[PDB]
Amino acid sequence: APRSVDWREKGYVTPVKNQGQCGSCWAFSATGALEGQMFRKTGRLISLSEQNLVDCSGPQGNEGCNGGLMDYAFQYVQDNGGLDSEESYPYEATEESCKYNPKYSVANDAGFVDIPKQEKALMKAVATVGPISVAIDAGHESFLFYKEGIYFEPDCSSEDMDHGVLVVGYGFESTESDNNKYWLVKNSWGEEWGMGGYVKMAKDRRNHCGIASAASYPTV
Ligand SMILES: *[C@@H](C(=O)O)[C@H](O)C(=O)N[C@@H](CC(C)C)C(=O)NCCCCNC(N)=[NH2+]
């Protein structure tokens, strides 16, 4: 595979969004991966509605601001036959009744693919598919205060993940410890967090923070 990948340079990735004080990370991760695969199919990048997922994907297993899973979001889009755009169904950071309108649907998918639980498999998927939905352990103060460099937290768990994000690429940079590889991750905490809203997560360090443990993308 390539040593470095960045799908933002190829037009696959919308700007960084902000989930607010709602536990809806799974919906931002899902819309990010589906935005990528829709662009791959149509050549058109359209920001998609996280609120649509928060309000409407309960029957697939999601629980709004109380949590969810990207795969359940992908199933909703397939079962529902569409997903509205961000502009038509804007984000309110609170769960309300479903207001989906098929006339304003701009995305579809036909299922999803779960990646095997190995960083080598995640790398191949990122290199060849596009941005990938992933789950990480983000419950540490060091993650809140991250400003730059490669994020490594010795107390991170590879099995207890609590936050959905989007891998948009990977790369390397020289460091003191010679642990130089990183996943390029888009978060949903606005652009004032981290590096304009992004984090470089340690790559090839024993599946750090579980980044390869629940990875998937939608089939368009
Ligand atoms: C994430 C956030 O808003 O920061 C939000 O709390 C969330 O959805 N968390 C998920 C974890 C994923 C990695 C996003 C969560 O804890 N809920 C998942 C419930 C699904 C139940 N089934 C299984 N298999 N866990």
Curated annotation (Swiss-Prot):
Zn(2+) 3 binds at residues 71, 114. Residues 176-178 form a propeptide. Zn(2+) 6 binds at residue 160. Zn(2+) 2 binds at residues 50, 86. Zn(2+) 1 binds at residue 9. Glycans are attached at residue 108. Zn(2+) 7 binds at residue 162. The active site is at 25, 163, 187. Zn(2+) 5 binds at residues 137, 140. It comes from the Eukaryota. Zn(2+) 4 binds at residues 92, 96. Disulfide bonds join 22-65, 56-98, 156-209. This is Cathepsin L. It comes from Homo sapiens (Human).
